[PDB]
Amino acid sequence: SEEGFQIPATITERYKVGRTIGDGNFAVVKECVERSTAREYALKIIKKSKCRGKEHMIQNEVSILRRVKHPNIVLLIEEMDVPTELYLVMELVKGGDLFDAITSTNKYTERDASGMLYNLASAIKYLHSLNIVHRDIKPENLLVYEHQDGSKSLKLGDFGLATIVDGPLYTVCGTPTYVAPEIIAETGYGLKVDIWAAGVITYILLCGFPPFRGSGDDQEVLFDQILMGQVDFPSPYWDNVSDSAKELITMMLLVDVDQRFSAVQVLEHPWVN
Amino acid sequence: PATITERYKVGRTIGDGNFAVVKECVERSTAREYALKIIKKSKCRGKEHMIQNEVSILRRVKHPNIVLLIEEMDVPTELYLVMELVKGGDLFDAITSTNKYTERDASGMLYNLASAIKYLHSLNIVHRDIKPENLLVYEHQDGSKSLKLGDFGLATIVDGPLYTVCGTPTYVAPEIIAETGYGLKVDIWAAGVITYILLCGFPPFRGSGDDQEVLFDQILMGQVDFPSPYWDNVSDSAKELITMMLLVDVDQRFSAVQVLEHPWVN
Ligand SMILES: N#CC[C@H](C1CCCC1)n1cc(-c2ncnc3[nH]ccc23)cn1
Ligand SMILES: N#CC[C@H](C1CCCC1)n1cc(-c2ncnc3[nH]ccc23)cn1
């Protein structure tokens, strides 16, 4: 391949591997056609070795992907473990990621925004029912599934940081823009860090900028805003948005974790029907 | 950055890796030698941004067998960590230069590592990446040598079973592979694997290039061999301790305290 992975003959036999559609650290995603059926799939190639000497490391993503199926979550079709790399065959999603879509159309209507939150809150409710926290919910990790109808669903991917919650966690991880206060505070966190992330994304969908923005002074500013957690809906940007939307986003972006909506409560809110 | 260039004369790279470089630096005012760790956060040739966990832990820990954090300068591009300098290189390099060590030198090194671990476990911190590459050789004036635990990238506070599958296969505990819940004692298993390598020069659980599942099944069953002629010289004491460190039963497996109370490290 372009990057220089030695593609196993087992893979090349079954699949024709196409162009790269997703790039990360120690992982690439490619288009690929199954030779028998002519059906299009996503091939995710994960490097186990760091390629920094023989610094062989272990992957956690596939433990999670095996035990989950949902319309609004990326689907693992099968896996090929090779000494060098882990190869995941997954359902292909052709509409790109939510980050790309937001940069293309600054804002979204409440109708389009609620539909996307309905999809994301559905994925999160399912994961949470299995005590799985994602810990990396962000636009770059939400894939746009385009229906023939013209309608668009979101599919959640990148379960790299996903784990099972059996009591409070303390690992400091995620993207600062989307990270919950209790992660920064290091007082312990669980499933509801995902609700916070979803609240931040919903806010961005409606106005085109995040609720907590850093400064050129320092990065401690962004973290100070998140810890304070005062959500503002400034004019003129939020003038023509409903109170209902503002209410829901508020309930998702509460520092008090017991008061912060669960995924069930988001889904029961009138703004998502 | 200017602010760092002012205080510190940054010398050569002494440690390299993914998203991180460690360089020798000297504080100009005091002529004091330090290690400068530069952690790039973006690492995506783009606007992508990620948070750093190592620093939360380093702030909490002070121990003679743990690398000491002196100060942190958070520039928007990268994070800078000034840390205690250890000039003796990593234990991996040390093992590759000296095939195997005497029992006395090995028990010495396990004393240092079990001391670090005991300290961390008393603060409910699991390290989760204990391996030769992450152990630094402190060279005393006497010419005696200590170990210092270096990288806390995967380190966290434990309040109930963890499930995240992480670490290096050679040193990974069976409960991590089994996905049944793990805690502090994954560090004891790692320490057992290292002790075994120190005495014979090879790991107790060895993989087939053809099948790495042979490695994991060995780990899962705790199939520890003490083969001849390699282990002919080594005492029953060393073999018995390693045995208690590499037990699959987490409840039976030695704590850091129990390792330290073992005659072989006394
Ligand atoms: N989500 C997310 C981020 C992820 C990148 C990060 C690591 C590999 C690429 N990614 C997955 C895809 C992707 N695109 C299209 N179909 C897909 N199916 C499964 C993953 C996938 C693209 N980027
Ligand atoms: N331990 C460990 C692994 C780590 C590497 C992995 C991330 C940066 C380099 N590393 C730290 C050092 C090091 N060497 C000498 N003095 C030091 N002080 C603090 C870290 C350090 C060398 N490699």
Author numbering:
A (entry chain A): 376 to 648
B (entry chain B): 383 to 648
Give sentences from the paper.
Doublecortin-like kinase 1 (DCLK) is a microtubule-associated serine/threonine kinase that contains two tandem doublecortin (DCX) domains on its N-terminus. The C-terminal kinase domain shows high resemblance to Ca2+/calmodulin-dependent protein kinase 1 (CaMKI) domain. Between the domains is a flexible PEST linker region rich in proline, glutamate, serine, and threonine and harboring multiple phosphorylation sites. Given the functional attributes of Doublecortin-like kinase 1 (DCLK1) in tumor growth, invasion, metastasis, cell motility, and tumor stemness, it is emerging as a therapeutic target in gastrointestinal cancers.
To provide reliable structural information for rational design of inhibitors and to further explore the mechanism of action of ruxolitinib, the crystal structure of the DCLK1 kinase domain in the complex of ruxolitinib (DCLK1KD·Ruxolitinib) was determined at 2.1 Å resolution by soaking a threefold molar excess of ruxolitinib into the AMPPNP-complexed DCLK1 crystal for substitution. Expectedly, the structure adopts the overall kinase domain architecture, with an N-lobe and a C-lobe, where the inter-lobe cleft represents the ATP binding site, which is occupied by the small molecule inhibitor, ruxolitinib. In accordance with the previously reported DCLK1 kinase domain structures, the DCLK1KD·Ruxolitinib structure displays an active-state conformation with a DFG-in conformation where the side chain of Asp533 is positioned toward the ATP-binding site and the Phe534 residue is in contact with the αC-helix of the N-terminal lobe. In addition, an inward disposition of the αC-helix positions Glu436 on the helix to form a salt bridge with strictly conserved Lys419. However, the DCLK1KD·Ruxolitinib structure shows dimer formation not mediated by any ligand mimicking the phosphorylated form, but still retains active conformation (left). In contrast, the β3-αC loop of the dimer structure of DCLK1KD·Ruxolitinib is flipped over by the large movement of Arg427Nη (18.4 Å), resulting in the concomitant shift of Glu515Oε (4.9 Å). In details, the pyrrolopyrimidine ring of ruxolitinib is sandwiched between Val404 and Ala417 of N-lobe and Leu518 of C-lobe via hydrophobic contacts and is oriented toward the hinge region to form two hydrogen bonds with the main chains of Glu466 and Val468 with the distances of 2.9 Å and 3.2 Å, respectively. The nitrile on the propanenitrile group confers a significant affinity for DCLK1, making an intensive network of interactions with the main chains of Glu515 and Asn516 on the C-lobe, which is in a similar position with the interactions for the ribose sugar of AMPPNP in the DCLK15JZJ·AMPPNP structure and with the side chains of invariant Lys419 and Glu436 on the N-lobe via a water molecule. The cyclopentyl group of ruxolitinib contributes to the tight binding by occupying a hydrophobic groove underneath a conserved glycine-rich loop, or P-loop, which connects the β1 and β2 strands.
